[PDB]
Each structure stands twice: as structure tokens, then as C-alpha cells.
């Protein structure tokens, strides 16, 4: 009987949550949490490349089919995460179909990319409105990812057109997607770009170059894996403005707020003081999101989980370290951060 979160924000942008299949089950209390508070859904893992095509030519439709049925039934949008990545992708993509000990060919990988993207996008035309077409293609160390930075796509496919630039595989992923669905919102998704000037420099250069080629990119997705320690609102606002200045929209795709700064701090108990501070920080973030929503350039904001009982941050970057990153706690109770969003007066903005 608490306020419905998405409704209270009164945003142009959709408010989403990442889920597993259990939130599609009516006998599960996570499902009613999703439909009460959110109007958009992303699959955390079940729409990744390895989940959708575990072996070549054998697509798995059951999970995404159930997702789209649930979403239509409950008047919710769906983001498709993700069509291309360098993690959670089957090994068969990058090896020669007849010699598993040798790499796939430019032509073979291009064709595989096209088949994966188009079979999936075509099936879900008009049911999945938005796709993370590529995920995390920029290295944290500078430039586009290659083998040294965990990805095999660019080394195999390379400079297809021979123009001296090798962003071809990314351009192709977008072109293939648009070809399969003229109406879908096509997103390049990444982490770290909200707080790293050097990484955002690369994102800006990449998107500028792709847009100049007529690449159908609609939005830059900011994962927004932040902590209670940073980055500051000013840094984020700056990165958001750089994205919006390119004429594309922004999406916040994987928002969570770790209680730890990195991997050195050992597990710690959650205190009401910590939760209050998290509430101030979430309030500030949602105030920032409103700035861009008022410009009509924020498409969606998605929390990376419904509640603290299902956060990937319990195992990243430290296996077995309990975090508290989301709007609802481990017993599905609304947290101070939730209360700051629906009733900003619950958050005291003065003392004495
Ligand atoms: Ca090229």
C-alpha cells in the first residue's frame, strides 16, 4: 500500500528493473514488486548471447517469450540486454566451424553476428522496444577493446571497408539490428563513462564517427554502477551533457549503488546512517535525471535488480561480500532511498 514508485516520479522516462525468471512467476513476491513499482523490464542474464543461442543455430525462445507475454499483460516496456558482448557469449562464435582450434573468419563472424542479431530482433519486433545492441565495447585502458582487453570481435572482423578505422563490427551490429526492426530504440551501453573523462572521450569519439557514417544509434546507455563514494553528481552531469550534445538520447541502464568503494574493504553491517547517506545520494541522482528528463533526452532509468536479495554486487568485485545497493532491502521492504524518491520530505534537508 506504499506509493507506486514510477508513478510518483512523474517522469517522461520509463522506470525499469533488471530481473531473473522468478519475477515472472505469480507465486513469487518479487513479481508483484516489479509490477507495482516499475513500468519497464530488463533481463539481467537470460537475454545475453549465451542464453539466447547456446549452440550454433539452436535458439532458446522460452524465457524471452515468457518475458514479452508478462510485459504486454502488465503494460510494461522491455529492454533487450544484450545482442553483443565479450562476456557470457558462447566460445563457438569465435572459432572456425570445422576447426575449433582455429579462429573464426571475418566473414564467418560477420555472418554469425547478423544471424544472432536479426533472428532475435525480428522475433521480438514491437514487443521489445529497446536493445542494448552492443555492450562495453570500449577498453578501460583506452580505445576499442581487443584481445588484450577481453574481446575477440575487433581482431577477427577488423577494418571491413578498409577506410583505416576498425569500428566496423560495431557499425554493422547497429545496421543489422535496424534492418530487422525499423522502430526499435538502439543503444550503445557502457560502464565507467559517467566518471572517467578518458573513457567518455573514447565514447564521444566513437559515437561521433559512427553517426557521421549514418549508423542508427539512438542512445548512449550509462550502466551507472556507482558507489556511495562516487562519482560526484557534477562529473556525471558533465558526461550526460557530452552524450546529449551528440544529438542522441541517454539511458541509465544498470543503476546500483554499492556500499563499498572497491575490492579492498571487507564486509560490513548496514546501518541506518549508511542507509540515510545512500538516500541522499539516490535523491541527488534522481534530481540529476530530472534535469535531462526535462530536456526530453532521458529514455529510461533501470535499477540493476529489484531488491538487495538479488544483487550481482554480492559477488562483484568480491565473491561472497554482502552489499546493499538497491531501493528495496533483502526482505523486500522499501529502503530510505525509496522513501526519498516518493516523498522527498522524508529526507531531512536541514538541522538546526
Ligand atoms: Ca572501417
Amino acid at each position: 500500500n506504499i506509493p507506486d514508485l514510477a508513478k510518483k516520479l512523474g517522469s517522461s522516462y520509463a522506470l525499469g528493473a533488471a530481473i531473473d525468471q522468478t519475477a515472472l512467476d505469480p507465486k513469487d513476491p518479487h513479481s508483484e514488486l516489479l509490477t507495482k513499482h516499475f513500468n519497464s523490464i530488463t533481463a539481467g542474464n537470460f537475454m545475453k548471447m549465451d542464453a539466447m543461442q547456446p549452440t550454433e543455430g539452436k535458439f532458446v525462445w522460452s524465457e524471452a517469450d515468457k518475458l514479452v507475454n508478462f510485459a504486454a499483460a502488465n503494460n510494461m516496456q522491455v529492454r533487450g540486454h544484450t545482442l553483443l558482448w565479450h562476456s557470457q557469449v558462447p566460445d563457438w562464435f569465435f572459432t572456425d566451424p570445422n576447426d575449433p582450434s582455429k579462429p573464426a573468419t571475418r566473414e564467418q563472424l560477420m555472418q554469425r553476428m547478423k544471424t544472432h542479431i536479426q533472428t532475435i530482433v525480428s522475433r521480438y519486433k514491437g514487443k521489445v522496444h529497446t536493445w542494448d545492441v552492443v555492450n562495453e565495447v570500449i577498453s578501460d585502458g583506452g580505445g576499442l577493446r581487443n584481445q588484450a582487453s577481453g574481446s575477440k570481435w575487433r581482431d577477427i572482423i577488423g577494418d571491413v571497408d578498409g577506410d583505416g578505422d576498425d569500428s566496423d563490427y560495431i557499425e554493422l551490429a547497429f545496421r543489422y539490428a535496424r534492418e530487422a526492426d525499423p522502430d526499435a530504440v538502439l543503444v550503445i551501453n557502457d560502464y565507467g563513462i559517467e566518471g572517467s573523462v578518458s573513457k567518455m572521450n573514447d565514447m564521444v569519439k566513437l559515437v561521433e564517427k559512427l553517426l557521421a557514417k549514418g549508423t542508427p544509434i539512438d542512445a548512449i546507455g550509462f550502466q551507472m554502477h556507482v558507489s556511495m563514494y562516487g562519482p560526484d553528481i557534477k562529473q556525471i552531469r558533465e558526461a550526460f551533457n557530452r552524450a546529449a550534445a551528440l544529438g542522441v538520447h541517454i539511458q541509465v541502464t544498470e543503476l546500483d549503488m554499492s556500499i563499498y568503494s572497491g575490492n579492498s574493504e571487507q564486509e560490513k553491517p548496514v546501518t541506518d546512517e549508511m542507509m540515510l547517506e545512500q538516500a541522499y545520494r539516490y535523491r541527488a541522482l534522481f534530481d540529476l535525471f530530472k534535469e535531462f528528463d526535462d530536456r526530453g533526452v532521458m529514455d529510461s532509468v533501470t535499477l540493476w535488480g529489484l531488491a538487495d536479495d538479488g544483487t550481482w554486487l554480492d559477488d562483484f568485485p568480491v565473491k561472497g561480500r554482502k552489499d546493499a545497493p538497491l531501493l528495496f532491502d533483502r526482505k523486500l521492504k522499501a529502503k530510505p532511498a525509496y522513501w526519498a524518491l516518493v516523498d522527498p520530505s522524508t529526507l531531512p534537508v536541514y538541522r538546526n
Side-chain angles (χ1 to χ4, degrees):
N1 296 324
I2 62 178
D4 293 356
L5 182 57
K7 277 162 57 65
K8 292 297 277 176
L9 296 170
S11 302
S12 288
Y13 65 73
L15 190 76
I19 64 163
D20 65 23
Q21 295 92 313
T22 316
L24 305 178
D25 184 342
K27 309 204 83 150
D28 194 295
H30 300 271
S31 190
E32 54 187 353
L33 194 70
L34 178 66
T35 55
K36 170 174 181 62
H37 292 292
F38 302 87
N39 54 35
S40 175
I41 311 168
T42 304
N45 294 285
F46 70 76
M47 291 187 61
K48 283 167 183 173
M49 298 183 80
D50 63 355
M52 296 301 295
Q53 207 193 345
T55 60
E56 192 163 22
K58 302 288 185 284
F59 289 88
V60 177
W61 302 129
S62 60
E63 311 306 283
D65 280 359
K66 195 184 178 169
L67 177 54
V68 295
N69 280 301
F70 182 96
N74 293 284
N75 189 27
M76 294 169 85
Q77 306 189 336
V78 174
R79 309 191 71 261
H81 180 74
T82 174
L83 296 163
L84 189 156
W85 198 21
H86 58 286
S87 183
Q88 297 178 258
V89 49
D91 288 340
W92 70 252
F93 266 93
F94 310 106
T95 63
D96 190 307
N98 293 111
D99 199 348
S101 70
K102 309 305 177 197
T105 278
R106 159 182 297 173
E107 286 78 15
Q108 289 162 346
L109 192 54
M110 280 177 60
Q111 180 55 66
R112 283 173 166 159
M113 182 173 82
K114 182 174 182 171
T115 298
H116 186 85
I117 288 169
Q118 296 194 330
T119 309
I120 297 172
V121 172
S122 190
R123 184 179 185 89
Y124 299 111
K125 268 187 313 221
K127 291 175 165 71
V128 177
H129 184 54
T130 310
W131 299 95
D132 291 326
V133 174
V134 306
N135 200 48
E136 304 175 6
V137 301
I138 300 166
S139 171
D140 295 306
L144 293 186
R145 291 191 184 283
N146 58 12
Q147 186 59 279
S149 50
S151 177
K152 299 165 196 173
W153 294 98
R154 179 160 77 88
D155 285 313
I156 293 174
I157 291 168
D159 182 9
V160 182
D161 68 0
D163 80 337
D165 178 81
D166 66 351
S167 69
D168 305 63
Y169 87 90
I170 297 153
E171 176 181 3
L172 286 171
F174 280 91
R175 291 192 182 275
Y176 295 155
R178 169 62 71 242
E179 195 184 311
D181 189 348
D183 303 322
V185 176
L186 307 184
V187 181
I188 172 172
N189 198 42
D190 223 322
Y191 66 92
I193 49 166
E194 77 274 29
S196 169
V197 170
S198 66
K199 199 172 179 179
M200 191 59 190
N201 282 350
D202 282 344
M203 182 60 83
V204 166
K205 287 172 174 174
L206 173 56
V207 172
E208 278 178 332
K209 160 183 57 177
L210 292 173
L211 286 176
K213 273 199 158 56
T215 307
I217 302 171
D218 297 307
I220 292 170
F222 289 83
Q223 293 190 12
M224 301 296 298
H225 292 300
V226 306
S227 75
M228 291 181 64
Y229 298 85
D232 68 75
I233 292 295
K234 172 176 179 165
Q235 300 171 256
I236 303 164
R237 182 185 291 104
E238 285 150 11
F240 278 12
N241 274 326
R242 293 182 75 193
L246 307 177
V248 305
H249 282 204
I250 296 153
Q251 311 199 351
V252 168
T253 61
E254 307 190 16
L255 180 61
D256 47 27
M257 186 189 302
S258 182
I259 69 175
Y260 307 100
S261 67
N263 64 2
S264 72
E265 178 165 48
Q266 313 168 28
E267 190 174 278
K268 68 189 171 189
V270 177
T271 65
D272 54 14
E273 176 55 30
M274 186 185 297
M275 296 295 93
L276 167 61
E277 295 180 24
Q278 176 173 70
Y280 284 121
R281 295 199 47 102
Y282 264 117
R283 184 64 269 182
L285 284 165
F286 278 83
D287 293 342
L288 177 69
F289 301 157
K290 180 167 188 299
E291 290 175 33
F292 291 85
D293 195 49
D294 284 349
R295 286 155 58 179
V297 294
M298 184 74 76
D299 291 334
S300 56
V301 173
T302 298
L303 279 293
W304 211 238
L306 286 163
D308 292 350
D309 68 328
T311 170
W312 76 302
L313 292 178
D314 277 0
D315 285 298
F316 181 90
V318 180
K319 186 187 181 192
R321 185 180 69 178
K322 304 290 175 306
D323 214 316
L326 299 157
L327 305 180
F328 298 88
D329 69 16
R330 284 172 193 267
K331 314 217 188 175
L332 313 190
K333 186 184 173 162
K335 282 161 78 184
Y338 158 96
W339 287 114
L341 299 186
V342 297
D343 185 9
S345 73
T346 55
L347 204 61
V349 303
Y350 53 78
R351 291 300 178 275
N352 216 235

